[PDB]
Amino acid sequence: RMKKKDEGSYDLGKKPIYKKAPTNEFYA
Amino acid sequence: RMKKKDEGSYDLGKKPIYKKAPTNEFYA
Numbered sequence: 001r002m003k004k005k006d007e008g009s010y011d012l013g014k015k016p017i018y019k020k021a022p023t024n025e026f027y028a
Numbered sequence: 029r030m031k032k033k034d035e036g037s038y039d040l041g042k043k044p045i046y047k048k049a050p051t052n053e054f055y056a
Binding site: 014 | 041042044046050051
């Protein structure tokens with residue numbers, strides 16, 4: 001995550017980040 | 029994500045979710 005911009009407090013702070021490879025299986 | 033509870037507006041809404049398996053490699 002390079003530069004950022006969250007000077008507007010309202011209802012958001014964390015973001016999603018799906019992208020791993022601990023093996024070769026898909027569960028959902 | 030089962031039940032939830034976000035009736036407090038402030039600075040959060042999305043969450044992280046690292047956990048994929050589109051292959052067998054790790055980049056970071």
